[PDB]
Design a protein around this ligand. Structure first.
Ligand SMILES: Cc1nsc(N2CCCNCC2)n1
Ligand SMILES: Cc1nsc(N2CCCNCC2)n1
Ligand SMILES: [Cl-]
Ligand SMILES: [Mg+2]
Ligand SMILES: [Mg+2]
Ligand SMILES: [Mg+2]
Ligand SMILES: [Mg+2]
Lengths: 194, 194
């Protein structure tokens, strides 16, 4: 019933553009929207985010997260490891590569979402959420070697899965970080289950 | 270690602006970023709210109440938590209960409210509070709920059982061109993983 009529470029940077979108609302009335897009998509999606489940025997299962300064936020954020998919890279391969670069862990793929939207009232940005387990008892994950790209500066923060939400609430209360909404949503559902 | 040096306006729409952010990297080097921001954020602890609405009814499985809308940035229909921007002076809890009623017709009760969490921190400064609300679906108030959408809001309500949310979402994605929101998908994944 609703559809895009046209898109007008307002402004194009190196990494992001702003567009004025015209669309038909369901009454037959024409309306506008200000829409953000990345200039880098080719791709099933812009990016991947990895849910990295660190499994060590005789330990709690952990979810591996990263902390980084985020210039759009003006501060540090706690997030799922993540990055843009390289042109002709598959979501799964992007997931293992990013996880290794950002955390030093080598993981196996468990499941892969379809493309999901990041903020659909604002942008067209999408990711694949890739659940990965990490056999923390293997020698390749003993002393994980993080291989950051240029200008990437990442701290690795592993938190127990069964208390994730309480552990994140504490980090916010004590360390003035912003937690990512997807991380928070995952933590909430771990508590809300059953 | 890292911090913002300057924020230069590039383009200001009615609703969105693009900025050139200059910041200090942890090596002591100046770097830049392209940052998206809304123009509507005043003194709110966040831009918006997203509601996690748990529909509870005697002798029913708990449902998660979701909405489907056309999203011009995406050029298509998206399945999301009920959500909206916080009005100036409105509390996050108030905004959540108000957006939930407007979008779905249901009258919720507050359960919990997150700190401000980031939407897509490598792209924008956009934040939300994720507000968990219970809906007493035995209450006559919530029997035959009537959405009260604002101007240009065109919303379908989709209630799915919490105990099968990820599979029910996958089934909707299999049947139409629609995108699931990343926070919803994240919440559904955690429900499986628990
Ligand atoms: C980013 C953006 N472009 S237009 C818009 N609004 C639509 C008009 C109704 N109010 C909701 C927000 N938001
Ligand atoms: C929106 C945006 N402004 S700079 C940027 N980077 C590309 C992604 C990783 N490399 C660092 C620079 N992205
Ligand atoms: Cl798992
Ligand atoms: Mg990254
Ligand atoms: Mg990376
Ligand atoms: Mg809304
Ligand atoms: Mg609304």
């Amino acid at each position: 019933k609703q559809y895009i009529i046209s898109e007008e470029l307002i402004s194009e940077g190196k990494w992001v553009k702003l567009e004025k979108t015209t669309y038909m609302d369901p009454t037959g009335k024409t309306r506008t929207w200000e829409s953000v897009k990345r200039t880098t998509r080719k791709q099933t999606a812009d990016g991947v985010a990895v849910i990295p489940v660190l499994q060590r025997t005789l330990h709690y299962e952990c979810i591996v997260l990263v902390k980084q300064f985020r210039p759009p936020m003006g501060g540090y954020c706690i997030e799922f490891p993540a990055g843009l998919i390289d042109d002709g890279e598959t979501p799964e391969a992007a997931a293992l590569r990013e996880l290794e670069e950002e955390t030093g862990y080598k993981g196996d793929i468990a499941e892969c979402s379809p493309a999901v939207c990041m903020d659909p009232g604002l942008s067209n940005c999408t990711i694949h959420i890739v659940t990965v387990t990490i056999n923390g008892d293997d020698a390749e994950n003993a002393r994980p070697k993080p291989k950051p790209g240029d200008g990437e500066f990442v701290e690795v923060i592993s938190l127990p899965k069964n208390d994730l939400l309480q552990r994140l609430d504490a980090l916010v209360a004590e360390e003035h970080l912003t937690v990512d909404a997807r991380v928070y949503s995952y933590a909430l559902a771990l508590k809300h289950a059953n």
